[PDB]
């Protein structure tokens, strides 16, 4: 299954990326989001179990990133606020496991969305 996305999100220095479920109906999922810096290793950004609404964000990125779910359309957004000039990076959309909410490994990945 391939997780489609919105598309290019180039904007002047709020941002709302989007993800969608395709091929598999929404069920036991732990959609997680990973930010790939242009020349650094991958970081971690958050995790959500949309079927219940339980959110959980990383240690550093508590005050900015607010991942929310939407059961109706099988989606999951960001509401990243107070954008900076050092956050220009690709934002994936990685699945996971729901029975291991505290030990999660990413299996499926999305194509990619530019943000700057």
CB 48 within 8 A of CB 30: yes
Q: Does 112 bind another protein (CB under 8 A)?
A: yes
Question: Site for another protein (CB under 8 A): which residue of 54, 79, 88, 114?
Answer: 54
Question: Would you give the binding string for another protein spanning residues 7-36, x where CB under 8 A is met?
Answer: ------------------xxxx---x----
- Structure tokens of 71? 């059961």
Which lies closer to another protein via its Cβ, residue 55 or residue 116? Answer: 55
Distance from C-alpha of 50 to C-alpha of 27, rounded to nearest angstrom: 9
Distance from C-alpha of 46 to C-alpha of 33, rounded to nearest angstrom: 6
Q: Which residues pair with 25 in a beta bridge?
A: none
Residues that bind another protein (CB under 8 A): 25-28, 32, 41-44, 49, 51-54, 56-59, 62, 71-74, 92, 98-99, 101-107, 109-112
């Amino acid at each position: 299954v391939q997780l489609v996305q919105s598309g290019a999100e180039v904007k002047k220095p709020s941002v709302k990326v989007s993800c969608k479920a395709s091929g598999f109906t929404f069920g036991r999922d732990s959609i997680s989001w990973v930010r790939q810096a242009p020349g650094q290793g991958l970081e971690w950004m958050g995790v959500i179990i949309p079927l219940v609404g339980i959110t959980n964000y990383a240690e550093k990125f508590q005050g900015r990133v607010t991942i929310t779910a939407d059961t109706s359309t099988n989606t999951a957004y960001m509401d990243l606020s107070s954008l900076r000039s050092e956050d220009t990076a690709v934002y994936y959309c990685a699945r996971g496991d729901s029975t291991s909410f505290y030990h999660n490994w990413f299996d499926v990945w999305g194509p990619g969305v530019l943000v700057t």
